[PDB]
Structure formats: C-alpha cells, structure tokens
Write a protein that holds these residues in place. Structure first.
Motif, PDB file in Angstrom:
ATOM      1  N   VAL A 126       5.048  11.128  -7.084  1.00 33.33           N
ATOM      2  CA  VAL A 126       5.835  10.617  -5.972  1.00 33.33           C
ATOM      3  C   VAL A 126       5.065   9.482  -5.319  1.00 33.33           C
ATOM      4  O   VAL A 126       3.889   9.630  -4.959  1.00 33.33           O
ATOM      5  CB  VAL A 126       6.178  11.709  -4.947  1.00 33.33           C
ATOM      6  N   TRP A 127       5.716   8.348  -5.191  1.00 32.58           N
ATOM      7  CA  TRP A 127       5.157   7.206  -4.498  1.00 32.58           C
ATOM      8  C   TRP A 127       5.780   7.149  -3.110  1.00 32.58           C
ATOM      9  O   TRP A 127       7.007   7.195  -2.979  1.00 32.58           O
ATOM     10  CB  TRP A 127       5.440   5.940  -5.300  1.00 32.58           C
ATOM     11  N   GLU A 128       4.939   7.077  -2.084  1.00 31.03           N
ATOM     12  CA  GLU A 128       5.392   7.073  -0.701  1.00 31.03           C
ATOM     13  C   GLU A 128       4.809   5.866   0.018  1.00 31.03           C
ATOM     14  O   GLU A 128       3.603   5.612  -0.059  1.00 31.03           O
ATOM     15  CB  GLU A 128       4.986   8.374   0.013  1.00 31.03           C
ATOM     16  N   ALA A 175       4.941  16.120 -11.037  1.00 34.68           N
ATOM     17  CA  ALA A 175       5.787  15.088 -10.439  1.00 34.68           C
ATOM     18  C   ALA A 175       4.918  14.051  -9.756  1.00 34.68           C
ATOM     19  O   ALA A 175       3.973  14.398  -9.043  1.00 34.68           O
ATOM     20  CB  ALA A 175       6.768  15.686  -9.429  1.00 34.68           C
ATOM     21  N   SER A 227       0.851  -1.173   0.000  1.00 36.29           N
ATOM     22  CA  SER A 227       0.000   0.000   0.000  1.00 36.29           C
ATOM     23  C   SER A 227       0.894   1.232   0.000  1.00 36.29           C
ATOM     24  O   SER A 227       2.119   1.134  -0.001  1.00 36.29           O
ATOM     25  CB  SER A 227      -0.978  -0.008   1.182  1.00 36.29           C
ATOM     26  N   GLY A 228       0.280   2.396  -0.038  1.00 32.61           N
ATOM     27  CA  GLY A 228       1.035   3.634  -0.067  1.00 32.61           C
ATOM     28  C   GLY A 228       0.196   4.717  -0.706  1.00 32.61           C
ATOM     29  O   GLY A 228      -0.961   4.511  -1.070  1.00 32.61           O
ATOM     30  N   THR A 229       0.810   5.886  -0.854  1.00 33.64           N
ATOM     31  CA  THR A 229       0.110   7.015  -1.458  1.00 33.64           C
ATOM     32  C   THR A 229       0.902   7.549  -2.644  1.00 33.64           C
ATOM     33  O   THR A 229       2.118   7.747  -2.551  1.00 33.64           O
ATOM     34  CB  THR A 229      -0.125   8.112  -0.421  1.00 33.64           C
ATOM     35  N   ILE A 230       0.216   7.751  -3.762  1.00 36.96           N
ATOM     36  CA  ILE A 230       0.779   8.459  -4.904  1.00 36.96           C
ATOM     37  C   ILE A 230       0.442   9.925  -4.737  1.00 36.96           C
ATOM     38  O   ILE A 230      -0.716  10.271  -4.488  1.00 36.96           O
ATOM     39  CB  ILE A 230       0.206   7.932  -6.231  1.00 36.96           C
ATOM     40  N   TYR A 231       1.435  10.790  -4.866  1.00 31.67           N
ATOM     41  CA  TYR A 231       1.180  12.222  -4.931  1.00 31.67           C
ATOM     42  C   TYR A 231       1.460  12.688  -6.343  1.00 31.67           C
ATOM     43  O   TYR A 231       2.557  12.467  -6.867  1.00 31.67           O
ATOM     44  CB  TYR A 231       2.047  12.993  -3.936  1.00 31.67           C
ATOM     45  N   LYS A 249      10.136   6.608  -0.022  1.00 34.71           N
ATOM     46  CA  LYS A 249       9.487   7.354  -1.097  1.00 34.71           C
ATOM     47  C   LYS A 249      10.397   7.346  -2.311  1.00 34.71           C
ATOM     48  O   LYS A 249      11.597   7.082  -2.205  1.00 34.71           O
ATOM     49  CB  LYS A 249       9.180   8.797  -0.701  1.00 34.71           C
ATOM     50  N   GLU A 250       9.817   7.624  -3.475  1.00 31.63           N
ATOM     51  CA  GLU A 250      10.606   7.624  -4.701  1.00 31.63           C
ATOM     52  C   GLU A 250       9.871   8.443  -5.749  1.00 31.63           C
ATOM     53  O   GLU A 250       8.642   8.519  -5.728  1.00 31.63           O
ATOM     54  CB  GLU A 250      10.856   6.204  -5.221  1.00 31.63           C
ATOM     55  N   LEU A 251      10.636   9.057  -6.659  1.00 28.74           N
ATOM     56  CA  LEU A 251      10.051   9.850  -7.738  1.00 28.74           C
ATOM     57  C   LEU A 251       9.729   8.909  -8.886  1.00 28.74           C
ATOM     58  O   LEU A 251      10.620   8.240  -9.415  1.00 28.74           O
ATOM     59  CB  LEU A 251      11.006  10.946  -8.198  1.00 28.74           C
TER      60      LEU A 251
END
Lengths: 79, 79
Positions: free
Chosen positions: A57-59, A55, A34-38, A66-68
């Motif tokens: 960003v997956w966190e 941009a 799971s996680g959040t895409i920004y 996190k990563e771009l």
C-alpha cells in the motif's frame, strides 16, 4: 532529461516488443513525491481456506491519498 | 494499520472479483520513500509514422534507481 526519455522508450520497447525510435522530448513536468509504502502480511479466508497474503500500500498523507500497489498470495496459514 | 489491511483486501476483491475475508494482520514493514516523477512527452517514430507519447518515470536518486511506470500513446505528431 533526454536521457530519461530514451530510457523510457527503451524500456517500453524491451517490455512490449516494440521498435519505437525516439525522436525528441517535447515537454517535461516533474513532481517531487514522498509517502510511505506499507508491506502488510495478512491472513484472509478464501472460500474457507485461511491463506496468507502480502499487500503493498502506497500512502501519500500530505494529499490524503492511498492506493493498493501489489497484492500476492504467500501461502497457506497453519492449521 | 488493520484499517490499511482491510482497504488492501477490499481493493483486491473489488479489482479481481474475489471474496477474500480479512482475518488479521500478522506482520507490517514500512518504508518512507521520496523521489521524482517525470511525466515526459516525447515524439518517437513507429514504423515511419511520427507519434507522440507520454512516459511516466519514477526516479529515486538516493538509491540510484529509476523505473518506467507508464507509457501511453498521445496521438500523431504534426506533418
């Protein structure tokens, strides 16, 4: 699962003009994630011209990660 | 969130030898995502040589979606 493997090989062939012939799965591991895409729209200045970028960003805060994922120019900012 | 945006711009600069100067966030959207990563080790035949590959498949079944994320050669299969 063999279905997913044949898909992966199909996609690789489709994408890189290959002809790998799928034989058999030999090992599978799987992780539920799971996680959040920004999706962040931001202004940044590129050699004096203020431009607008998007941009992705997956966190994954449950593992302090996190990563771009994507970074793209949208266009010029108003002037 | 400005923190995430500065990170994204830093990463883009770090990755493509850029010098974008972050100005401001103008819009943020965010999506919570779950799904399963499959790391599938499989044999496939490449022009007669049986080789071993690792494929990373991301599947989001709650939206009937999957995609190939990575595909890499591991080595030769035993003969």
């Amino acid at each position: 699962i063999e279905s997913l493997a044949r898909y992966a090989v199909d996609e690789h062939n489709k994408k890189q003009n290959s002809l790998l012939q799928f034989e058999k799965v030999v090992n599978t591991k799987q992780q539920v994630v799971s996680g959040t895409i920004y999706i962040i729209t931001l202004e940044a200045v590129d050699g004096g011209k203020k431009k607008v970028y998007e941009a992705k960003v997956w966190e994954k805060p449950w593992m302090n990660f996190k990563e771009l994922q994507e970074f793209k120019l949208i266009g010029d900012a108003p002037s």
